[PDB]
Amino acid sequence: FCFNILCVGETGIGKSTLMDTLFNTKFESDPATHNEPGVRLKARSYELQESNVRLKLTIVDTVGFGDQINKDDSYKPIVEYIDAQFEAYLQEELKIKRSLFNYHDTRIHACLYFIAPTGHSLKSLDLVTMKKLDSKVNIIPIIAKADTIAKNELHKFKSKIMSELVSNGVQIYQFPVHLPFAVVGSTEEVKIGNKMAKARQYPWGVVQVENENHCDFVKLREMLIRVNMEDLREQTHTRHYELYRRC
Protein backbone atom coordinates (compact mmCIF):
# COMPACT_ATOMS: atom_id res chain seq x y z
CA PHE A 1 0.00 0.00 0.00
CA CYS A 2 2.47 2.62 1.24
CA PHE A 3 5.97 2.76 -0.24
CA ASN A 4 8.57 5.50 0.19
CA ILE A 5 11.58 5.75 -2.14
CA LEU A 6 14.55 8.04 -1.56
CA CYS A 7 16.58 9.07 -4.62
CA VAL A 8 20.08 10.28 -3.71
CA GLY A 9 22.03 11.58 -6.67
CA GLU A 10 23.88 14.53 -8.15
CA THR A 11 21.97 17.32 -9.87
CA GLY A 12 20.73 16.19 -13.27
CA ILE A 13 21.97 12.60 -12.85
CA GLY A 14 18.56 11.27 -13.89
CA LYS A 15 16.54 10.77 -10.70
CA SER A 16 13.24 12.17 -11.98
CA THR A 17 13.63 10.48 -15.37
CA LEU A 18 14.26 7.07 -13.81
CA MET A 19 11.22 7.31 -11.52
CA ASP A 20 8.99 8.32 -14.44
CA THR A 21 10.32 5.34 -16.39
CA LEU A 22 10.00 2.93 -13.44
CA PHE A 23 6.31 3.71 -12.88
CA ASN A 24 5.50 4.57 -16.52
CA THR A 25 4.00 7.98 -15.77
CA LYS A 26 5.02 11.63 -15.33
CA PHE A 27 5.65 12.74 -11.76
CA GLU A 28 6.71 16.26 -10.81
CA SER A 29 10.19 16.58 -12.31
CA ASP A 30 11.17 20.25 -12.14
CA PRO A 31 14.98 20.39 -12.46
CA ALA A 32 17.14 21.95 -9.78
CA THR A 33 19.79 24.54 -10.40
CA HIS A 34 23.43 23.82 -9.58
CA ASN A 35 23.54 26.84 -7.24
CA GLU A 36 21.69 25.56 -4.17
CA PRO A 37 23.64 26.58 -1.02
CA GLY A 38 23.25 23.09 0.44
CA VAL A 39 21.48 19.77 0.23
CA ARG A 40 17.72 19.80 0.78
CA LEU A 41 14.95 17.32 0.05
CA LYS A 42 11.78 17.43 -2.05
CA ALA A 43 9.01 14.99 -1.13
CA ARG A 44 5.95 14.29 -3.28
CA SER A 45 3.19 11.71 -2.81
CA TYR A 46 1.17 10.03 -5.55
CA GLU A 47 -1.73 7.57 -5.65
CA LEU A 48 -0.90 4.86 -8.20
CA GLN A 49 -2.05 1.42 -9.26
CA GLU A 50 0.97 -0.89 -9.58
CA SER A 51 -0.66 -4.08 -10.95
CA ASN A 52 -3.74 -4.64 -8.80
CA VAL A 53 -2.44 -2.86 -5.70
CA ARG A 54 -3.47 0.59 -4.45
CA LEU A 55 -0.09 2.25 -4.03
CA LYS A 56 0.48 5.40 -1.97
CA LEU A 57 3.93 6.23 -3.33
CA THR A 58 6.14 8.97 -1.89
CA ILE A 59 9.24 9.97 -3.85
CA VAL A 60 11.89 11.93 -1.95
CA ASP A 61 14.66 13.48 -4.07
CA THR A 62 17.84 15.18 -2.97
CA VAL A 63 18.24 18.73 -4.23
CA GLY A 64 21.69 20.26 -4.67
CA PHE A 65 23.61 17.07 -3.84
CA GLY A 66 27.19 17.32 -5.08
CA ASP A 67 26.88 20.91 -6.29
CA GLN A 68 28.70 22.92 -3.62
CA ILE A 69 32.44 23.53 -3.68
CA ASN A 70 32.48 22.45 -0.02
CA LYS A 71 30.58 19.15 0.13
CA ASP A 72 31.12 18.64 3.89
CA ASP A 73 28.12 17.18 5.72
CA SER A 74 26.06 16.78 2.54
CA TYR A 75 24.57 13.67 4.17
CA LYS A 76 23.19 15.55 7.19
CA PRO A 77 19.92 16.87 5.67
CA ILE A 78 19.30 13.40 4.22
CA VAL A 79 19.84 11.70 7.59
CA GLU A 80 17.69 14.38 9.24
CA TYR A 81 14.77 13.51 6.96
CA ILE A 82 15.21 9.77 7.47
CA ASP A 83 15.46 10.22 11.24
CA ALA A 84 12.40 12.50 11.28
CA GLN A 85 10.26 9.72 9.80
CA PHE A 86 11.68 7.26 12.34
CA GLU A 87 10.78 9.68 15.13
CA ALA A 88 7.27 10.26 13.76
CA TYR A 89 6.69 6.51 13.72
CA LEU A 90 8.04 6.17 17.26
CA GLN A 91 5.77 8.96 18.52
CA GLU A 92 2.86 7.06 16.96
CA GLU A 93 3.87 3.92 18.88
CA LEU A 94 3.99 5.93 22.13
CA LYS A 95 0.45 7.27 21.83
CA ILE A 96 -2.03 6.16 24.48
CA LYS A 97 -5.06 6.00 22.21
CA ARG A 98 -3.25 4.87 19.07
CA SER A 99 -4.10 3.40 15.67
CA LEU A 100 -0.95 2.06 14.00
CA PHE A 101 -3.20 0.31 11.48
CA ASN A 102 -4.45 3.74 10.35
CA TYR A 103 -0.98 5.32 10.33
CA HIS A 104 0.55 6.45 7.03
CA ASP A 105 4.12 5.13 7.27
CA THR A 106 6.54 7.82 6.06
CA ARG A 107 9.79 5.94 6.70
CA ILE A 108 12.06 5.49 3.69
CA HIS A 109 11.71 1.88 2.56
CA ALA A 110 14.31 2.00 -0.24
CA CYS A 111 17.18 4.33 -1.14
CA LEU A 112 18.22 4.42 -4.78
CA TYR A 113 21.78 5.75 -4.72
CA PHE A 114 22.65 7.11 -8.17
CA ILE A 115 26.33 6.55 -9.00
CA ALA A 116 27.62 8.84 -11.74
CA PRO A 117 29.13 6.77 -14.60
CA THR A 118 32.75 7.90 -14.30
CA GLY A 119 34.07 4.49 -15.32
CA HIS A 120 36.51 4.55 -12.39
CA SER A 121 34.94 3.60 -9.05
CA LEU A 122 33.24 5.69 -6.33
CA LYS A 123 33.56 9.40 -5.74
CA SER A 124 34.57 10.47 -2.25
CA LEU A 125 31.10 11.95 -1.79
CA ASP A 126 29.53 8.62 -2.77
CA LEU A 127 31.52 6.71 -0.17
CA VAL A 128 30.99 9.22 2.65
CA THR A 129 27.24 9.54 2.04
CA MET A 130 26.49 5.83 1.59
CA LYS A 131 28.46 5.03 4.75
CA LYS A 132 26.32 7.53 6.67
CA LEU A 133 23.10 6.04 5.26
CA ASP A 134 23.74 2.29 5.26
CA SER A 135 22.37 1.68 8.78
CA LYS A 136 19.36 3.97 8.20
CA VAL A 137 17.91 2.79 4.87
CA ASN A 138 17.95 -0.08 2.37
CA ILE A 139 20.59 1.19 -0.06
CA ILE A 140 20.20 0.04 -3.65
CA PRO A 141 23.23 1.35 -5.55
CA ILE A 142 22.69 1.92 -9.26
CA ILE A 143 24.88 3.21 -12.07
CA ALA A 144 23.02 6.21 -13.49
CA LYS A 145 23.01 7.13 -17.19
CA ALA A 146 24.57 3.73 -17.83
CA ASP A 147 24.47 4.16 -21.60
CA THR A 148 27.67 6.16 -20.91
CA ILE A 149 29.61 2.95 -20.27
CA ALA A 150 30.78 0.88 -23.22
CA LYS A 151 30.16 -2.85 -23.44
CA ASN A 152 33.83 -3.55 -22.66
CA GLU A 153 33.81 -1.25 -19.60
CA LEU A 154 30.62 -2.16 -17.74
CA HIS A 155 31.70 -5.38 -16.00
CA LYS A 156 34.98 -3.88 -14.74
CA PHE A 157 33.20 -0.74 -13.52
CA LYS A 158 30.54 -2.77 -11.68
CA SER A 159 33.28 -4.86 -10.06
CA LYS A 160 35.30 -1.80 -9.02
CA ILE A 161 32.19 -0.28 -7.42
CA MET A 162 31.32 -3.43 -5.46
CA SER A 163 34.94 -3.86 -4.35
CA GLU A 164 34.84 -0.33 -2.92
CA LEU A 165 31.56 -1.06 -1.13
CA VAL A 166 32.95 -4.30 0.32
CA SER A 167 36.36 -2.98 1.34
CA ASN A 168 34.77 0.05 3.01
CA GLY A 169 32.10 -2.01 4.79
CA VAL A 170 29.09 -0.30 3.19
CA GLN A 171 25.99 -2.35 4.02
CA ILE A 172 23.67 -2.53 1.01
CA TYR A 173 20.29 -4.19 0.68
CA GLN A 174 20.36 -7.92 -0.11
CA PHE A 175 17.51 -9.09 -2.34
CA PRO A 176 15.88 -12.34 -1.00
CA VAL A 177 22.21 -9.81 -13.26
CA HIS A 178 25.49 -8.45 -11.91
CA LEU A 179 25.21 -5.70 -9.29
CA PRO A 180 25.02 -2.73 -9.14
CA PHE A 181 22.13 -2.29 -11.59
CA ALA A 182 23.24 -0.28 -14.63
CA VAL A 183 20.09 1.61 -15.58
CA VAL A 184 18.89 3.87 -18.37
CA GLY A 185 15.84 6.11 -18.03
CA SER A 186 13.78 7.78 -20.74
CA THR A 187 10.38 9.42 -21.14
CA GLU A 188 10.91 9.61 -24.92
CA GLU A 189 9.71 6.96 -27.35
CA VAL A 190 11.36 5.43 -30.41
CA LYS A 191 9.76 3.08 -32.91
CA ILE A 192 11.36 -0.34 -32.36
CA GLY A 193 9.97 -3.04 -34.59
CA ASN A 194 6.31 -2.08 -34.88
CA LYS A 195 5.99 -0.69 -31.33
CA MET A 196 6.79 2.57 -29.56
CA ALA A 197 9.32 1.90 -26.79
CA LYS A 198 10.90 4.10 -24.15
CA ALA A 199 14.34 4.72 -25.57
CA ARG A 200 17.13 7.20 -26.26
CA GLN A 201 17.81 7.98 -29.93
CA TYR A 202 21.43 8.74 -30.86
CA PRO A 203 22.84 9.35 -34.36
CA TRP A 204 24.51 5.93 -34.03
CA GLY A 205 21.78 3.83 -32.41
CA VAL A 206 18.81 3.48 -30.09
CA VAL A 207 19.16 2.52 -26.42
CA GLN A 208 16.01 0.61 -25.46
CA VAL A 209 15.14 0.91 -21.77
CA GLU A 210 13.37 -2.47 -21.62
CA ASN A 211 16.04 -4.33 -23.63
CA GLU A 212 17.81 -6.35 -20.93
CA ASN A 213 20.88 -6.58 -23.19
CA HIS A 214 21.08 -2.76 -23.14
CA CYS A 215 20.65 -2.06 -19.40
CA ASP A 216 19.36 -3.48 -16.11
CA PHE A 217 16.16 -1.42 -15.95
CA VAL A 218 13.87 -4.46 -16.22
CA LYS A 219 15.76 -6.14 -13.37
CA LEU A 220 15.57 -3.02 -11.20
CA ARG A 221 11.83 -2.64 -11.79
CA GLU A 222 11.35 -6.35 -11.10
CA MET A 223 13.37 -6.48 -7.88
CA LEU A 224 12.31 -3.12 -6.44
CA ILE A 225 8.63 -2.89 -7.41
CA ARG A 226 7.25 -6.24 -8.58
CA VAL A 227 8.89 -8.61 -6.09
CA ASN A 228 10.54 -7.28 -2.95
CA MET A 229 8.38 -4.30 -1.98
CA GLU A 230 7.12 -6.03 1.17
CA ASP A 231 10.60 -7.20 2.17
CA LEU A 232 12.02 -3.69 1.81
CA ARG A 233 9.27 -2.40 4.11
CA GLU A 234 9.89 -5.18 6.64
CA GLN A 235 13.67 -4.70 6.71
CA THR A 236 13.00 -0.99 7.26
CA HIS A 237 10.78 -1.79 10.24
CA THR A 238 12.66 -4.70 11.83
CA ARG A 239 16.25 -3.56 11.23
CA HIS A 240 16.73 0.15 10.44
CA TYR A 241 13.82 1.52 12.49
CA GLU A 242 14.63 -0.86 15.35
CA LEU A 243 18.19 0.48 15.50
CA TYR A 244 16.84 4.03 15.83
CA ARG A 245 14.20 2.94 18.36
CA ARG A 246 16.84 1.27 20.54
CA CYS A 247 18.03 4.83 21.29
Next chain:
Amino acid sequence: FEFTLMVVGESGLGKSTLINSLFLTDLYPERVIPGAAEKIERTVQIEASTVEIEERGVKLRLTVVDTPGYGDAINCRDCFKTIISYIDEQFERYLHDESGLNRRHIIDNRVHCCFYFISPFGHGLKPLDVAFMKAIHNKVNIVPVIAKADTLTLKERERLKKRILDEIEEHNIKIYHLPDAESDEDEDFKEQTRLLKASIPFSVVGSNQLIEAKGKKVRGRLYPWGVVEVENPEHNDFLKLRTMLITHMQDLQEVTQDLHYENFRSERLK
Protein backbone atom coordinates in the same frame (compact mmCIF):
# COMPACT_ATOMS: atom_id res chain seq x y z
CA PHE B 1 58.36 25.74 -31.24
CA GLU B 2 57.06 24.71 -27.82
CA PHE B 3 53.40 24.61 -26.81
CA THR B 4 52.05 24.02 -23.30
CA LEU B 5 48.49 22.72 -22.85
CA MET B 6 46.92 22.53 -19.39
CA VAL B 7 44.10 20.04 -18.72
CA VAL B 8 41.62 20.55 -15.86
CA GLY B 9 38.38 18.76 -15.03
CA GLU B 10 36.63 16.34 -12.70
CA SER B 11 38.21 12.90 -12.61
CA GLY B 12 36.54 10.35 -14.85
CA LEU B 13 35.45 12.66 -17.69
CA GLY B 14 37.61 10.87 -20.26
CA LYS B 15 40.31 13.55 -20.18
CA SER B 16 43.34 11.27 -20.48
CA THR B 17 41.57 9.32 -23.24
CA LEU B 18 40.83 12.47 -25.25
CA ILE B 19 44.34 13.87 -24.79
CA ASN B 20 45.91 10.64 -26.03
CA SER B 21 43.46 10.62 -28.94
CA LEU B 22 44.54 14.08 -30.11
CA PHE B 23 48.20 13.18 -30.64
CA LEU B 24 48.24 9.35 -30.64
CA THR B 25 50.32 9.39 -27.46
CA ASP B 26 50.54 7.36 -24.24
CA LEU B 27 51.08 10.01 -21.57
CA TYR B 28 49.67 8.06 -18.59
CA PRO B 29 51.16 4.54 -18.71
CA GLU B 30 51.73 4.33 -14.93
CA ARG B 31 48.76 6.40 -13.75
CA VAL B 32 47.06 5.06 -10.61
CA ILE B 33 43.47 6.08 -9.88
CA PRO B 34 43.00 6.32 -6.09
CA GLY B 35 40.14 4.66 -4.27
CA ALA B 36 37.21 6.62 -2.90
CA ALA B 37 38.58 6.69 0.66
CA GLU B 38 41.88 8.10 -0.63
CA LYS B 39 40.03 10.82 -2.56
CA ILE B 40 38.26 12.27 0.51
CA GLU B 41 41.12 14.72 1.22
CA ARG B 42 43.14 14.45 -2.00
CA THR B 43 45.28 17.44 -2.98
CA VAL B 44 45.81 18.74 -6.50
CA GLN B 45 49.21 17.89 -7.97
CA ILE B 46 50.81 19.20 -11.17
CA GLU B 47 52.08 16.62 -13.64
CA ALA B 48 53.78 17.65 -16.88
CA SER B 49 54.46 15.34 -19.82
CA THR B 50 56.47 16.52 -22.83
CA VAL B 51 56.42 14.74 -26.20
CA GLU B 52 57.57 15.46 -29.75
CA ILE B 53 54.67 15.87 -32.20
CA GLU B 54 55.22 15.91 -35.97
CA GLU B 55 51.78 16.81 -37.33
CA ARG B 56 51.90 17.09 -41.13
CA GLY B 57 55.49 18.23 -41.70
CA VAL B 58 56.08 20.49 -38.68
CA LYS B 59 57.66 19.14 -35.48
CA LEU B 60 56.81 20.69 -32.12
CA ARG B 61 57.46 20.13 -28.41
CA LEU B 62 54.08 19.58 -26.76
CA THR B 63 53.87 19.78 -22.97
CA VAL B 64 50.63 18.55 -21.40
CA VAL B 65 50.18 19.84 -17.85
CA ASP B 66 47.66 17.69 -16.00
CA THR B 67 46.11 18.51 -12.63
CA PRO B 68 45.27 15.15 -11.01
CA GLY B 69 43.22 15.54 -7.84
CA TYR B 70 41.16 18.48 -9.10
CA GLY B 71 37.63 18.08 -7.78
CA ASP B 72 38.29 14.82 -5.92
CA ALA B 73 38.14 16.03 -2.31
CA ILE B 74 34.94 16.43 -0.31
CA ASN B 75 35.92 20.04 0.40
CA CYS B 76 37.42 21.56 -2.77
CA ARG B 77 38.31 24.93 -1.20
CA ASP B 78 42.00 25.12 -2.17
CA CYS B 79 41.64 23.05 -5.35
CA PHE B 80 42.77 26.18 -7.27
CA LYS B 81 45.80 27.41 -5.32
CA THR B 82 48.32 24.93 -6.74
CA ILE B 83 47.09 25.41 -10.31
CA ILE B 84 47.04 29.20 -10.05
CA SER B 85 50.49 29.19 -8.43
CA TYR B 86 51.87 27.06 -11.26
CA ILE B 87 50.52 29.40 -13.96
CA ASP B 88 51.86 32.51 -12.21
CA GLU B 89 55.22 30.82 -11.57
CA GLN B 90 55.76 30.27 -15.30
CA PHE B 91 55.01 33.97 -15.86
CA GLU B 92 57.49 34.73 -13.08
CA ARG B 93 60.27 32.62 -14.60
CA TYR B 94 59.75 34.12 -18.06
CA LEU B 95 59.87 37.66 -16.66
CA HIS B 96 63.17 36.95 -14.90
CA ASP B 97 64.57 35.24 -18.00
CA GLU B 98 63.63 38.00 -20.46
CA SER B 99 64.99 40.66 -18.07
CA GLY B 100 68.32 38.86 -17.70
CA LEU B 101 71.43 38.71 -19.85
CA ASN B 102 70.87 35.07 -20.92
CA ARG B 103 67.85 35.98 -23.05
CA ARG B 104 69.20 33.79 -25.88
CA HIS B 105 68.28 30.45 -24.28
CA ILE B 106 64.89 31.18 -22.69
CA ILE B 107 62.66 28.15 -22.20
CA ASP B 108 59.06 29.39 -22.41
CA ASN B 109 57.02 27.33 -19.94
CA ARG B 110 54.02 29.68 -19.86
CA VAL B 111 50.69 27.90 -20.25
CA HIS B 112 49.30 28.66 -23.70
CA CYS B 113 45.89 26.99 -23.40
CA CYS B 114 43.69 25.30 -20.80
CA PHE B 115 41.18 22.63 -21.80
CA TYR B 116 38.48 22.80 -19.14
CA PHE B 117 36.39 19.63 -19.32
CA ILE B 118 32.73 20.16 -18.37
CA SER B 119 30.61 17.24 -17.25
CA PRO B 120 27.73 16.30 -19.59
CA PHE B 121 25.85 14.68 -16.69
CA GLY B 122 24.39 17.85 -15.12
CA HIS B 123 22.28 20.64 -16.54
CA GLY B 124 25.13 23.11 -16.98
CA LEU B 125 28.15 24.66 -15.33
CA LYS B 126 28.65 23.86 -11.65
CA PRO B 127 29.88 26.33 -9.01
CA LEU B 128 33.33 24.70 -9.11
CA ASP B 129 33.52 25.16 -12.90
CA VAL B 130 32.55 28.83 -12.68
CA ALA B 131 34.94 29.63 -9.83
CA PHE B 132 37.93 27.94 -11.47
CA MET B 133 37.39 29.65 -14.82
CA LYS B 134 36.95 33.02 -13.13
CA ALA B 135 40.16 32.30 -11.21
CA ILE B 136 42.26 31.73 -14.35
CA HIS B 137 40.44 33.47 -17.21
CA ASN B 138 42.76 36.50 -16.93
CA LYS B 139 45.83 34.23 -16.94
CA VAL B 140 45.28 31.55 -19.62
CA ASN B 141 43.33 30.89 -22.83
CA ILE B 142 40.34 28.82 -21.67
CA VAL B 143 38.90 26.28 -24.12
CA PRO B 144 35.77 24.74 -22.57
CA VAL B 145 35.13 21.16 -23.63
CA ILE B 146 32.01 19.04 -23.09
CA ALA B 147 33.31 15.61 -22.11
CA LYS B 148 31.83 12.23 -23.08
CA ALA B 149 29.58 13.75 -25.72
CA ASP B 150 28.17 10.32 -26.61
CA THR B 151 26.02 10.55 -23.47
CA LEU B 152 23.96 13.30 -25.13
CA THR B 153 21.34 13.12 -27.83
CA LEU B 154 21.49 15.90 -30.40
CA LYS B 155 18.75 17.87 -28.61
CA GLU B 156 20.43 17.40 -25.22
CA ARG B 157 23.74 18.45 -26.77
CA GLU B 158 22.27 21.60 -28.32
CA ARG B 159 20.57 22.42 -25.01
CA LEU B 160 23.74 22.00 -22.95
CA LYS B 161 25.92 24.03 -25.34
CA LYS B 162 23.41 26.88 -25.38
CA ARG B 163 23.23 26.90 -21.58
CA ILE B 164 27.02 26.80 -21.12
CA LEU B 165 27.34 29.79 -23.45
CA ASP B 166 24.63 31.68 -21.53
CA GLU B 167 26.32 30.97 -18.20
CA ILE B 168 29.76 32.03 -19.45
CA GLU B 169 28.17 35.36 -20.39
CA GLU B 170 26.15 35.56 -17.17
CA HIS B 171 29.31 35.09 -15.07
CA ASN B 172 31.48 37.33 -17.31
CA ILE B 173 33.91 34.48 -18.01
CA LYS B 174 36.49 35.25 -20.70
CA ILE B 175 37.22 32.19 -22.81
CA TYR B 176 39.51 32.04 -25.83
CA HIS B 177 37.95 33.56 -28.95
CA LEU B 178 39.10 32.44 -32.37
CA PRO B 179 40.44 35.21 -34.63
CA ASP B 180 37.99 36.44 -37.24
CA ALA B 181 38.83 35.34 -40.77
CA GLU B 182 40.37 38.06 -42.91
CA SER B 183 38.79 39.19 -46.17
CA ASP B 184 41.81 38.16 -48.27
CA GLU B 185 41.32 34.52 -47.21
CA ASP B 186 39.28 32.39 -49.58
CA GLU B 187 35.65 31.44 -49.01
CA ASP B 188 36.21 27.88 -47.77
CA PHE B 189 38.53 29.15 -45.03
CA LYS B 190 36.10 31.83 -43.84
CA GLU B 191 33.38 29.18 -43.66
CA GLN B 192 35.84 26.94 -41.81
CA THR B 193 36.38 29.58 -39.12
CA ARG B 194 32.61 30.09 -38.96
CA LEU B 195 31.88 26.37 -38.50
CA LEU B 196 34.45 26.03 -35.71
CA LYS B 197 33.09 29.10 -33.91
CA ALA B 198 29.52 27.82 -34.16
CA SER B 199 30.35 24.54 -32.38
CA ILE B 200 31.97 26.10 -29.30
CA PRO B 201 31.90 24.64 -26.72
CA PHE B 202 33.16 21.51 -28.48
CA SER B 203 31.46 18.28 -27.36
CA VAL B 204 33.98 15.51 -27.89
CA VAL B 205 34.47 11.76 -27.75
CA GLY B 206 37.82 10.04 -27.27
CA SER B 207 38.86 6.41 -27.63
CA ASN B 208 41.90 4.13 -27.53
CA GLN B 209 39.89 1.31 -29.15
CA LEU B 210 39.56 0.17 -32.75
CA ILE B 211 35.96 -0.71 -33.61
CA GLU B 212 34.08 -1.72 -36.78
CA ALA B 213 32.51 1.34 -38.39
CA LYS B 214 31.20 -1.04 -41.08
CA GLY B 215 33.87 -1.28 -43.77
CA LYS B 216 36.89 -0.10 -41.80
CA LYS B 217 38.59 -0.27 -38.40
CA VAL B 218 38.36 3.23 -36.91
CA ARG B 219 38.59 4.96 -33.54
CA GLY B 220 35.41 4.62 -31.58
CA ARG B 221 33.34 3.22 -28.75
CA LEU B 222 31.23 0.07 -29.07
CA TYR B 223 27.80 -0.24 -27.47
CA PRO B 224 25.19 -3.01 -27.89
CA TRP B 225 23.07 -0.51 -29.87
CA GLY B 226 25.74 0.96 -32.15
CA VAL B 227 29.18 2.47 -32.54
CA VAL B 228 30.37 6.03 -31.87
CA GLU B 229 33.14 7.12 -34.26
CA VAL B 230 35.70 9.55 -32.83
CA GLU B 231 36.48 11.11 -36.22
CA ASN B 232 32.86 11.27 -37.45
CA PRO B 233 31.91 14.98 -37.28
CA GLU B 234 28.25 13.88 -37.23
CA HIS B 235 28.93 12.02 -33.97
CA ASN B 236 31.05 14.52 -32.00
CA ASP B 237 33.39 17.49 -32.28
CA PHE B 238 36.77 15.75 -31.83
CA LEU B 239 37.99 16.81 -35.28
CA LYS B 240 36.89 20.41 -34.74
CA LEU B 241 38.76 20.55 -31.43
CA ARG B 242 41.84 18.97 -33.00
CA THR B 243 41.72 21.26 -36.04
CA MET B 244 41.08 24.33 -33.89
CA LEU B 245 44.09 23.57 -31.69
CA ILE B 246 46.50 22.87 -34.54
CA THR B 247 45.30 25.81 -36.64
CA HIS B 248 45.41 28.30 -33.75
CA MET B 249 48.43 27.11 -31.75
CA GLN B 250 50.39 30.16 -32.88
CA ASP B 251 47.58 32.58 -32.03
CA LEU B 252 47.14 30.91 -28.64
CA GLN B 253 50.84 31.48 -27.93
CA GLU B 254 50.63 35.10 -29.10
CA VAL B 255 47.63 35.91 -26.91
CA THR B 256 49.41 34.32 -23.94
CA GLN B 257 52.37 36.63 -24.60
CA ASP B 258 50.55 39.81 -25.63
CA LEU B 259 47.57 39.67 -23.22
CA HIS B 260 47.96 37.36 -20.21
CA TYR B 261 51.71 37.75 -19.73
CA GLU B 262 51.59 41.53 -20.17
CA ASN B 263 48.73 41.80 -17.67
CA PHE B 264 50.72 39.69 -15.22
CA ARG B 265 53.74 41.89 -15.87
CA SER B 266 52.01 45.21 -15.18
CA GLU B 267 50.02 43.84 -12.23
CA ARG B 268 53.42 42.68 -10.90
CA LEU B 269 54.58 46.17 -9.88
CA LYS B 270 54.56 46.76 -6.12
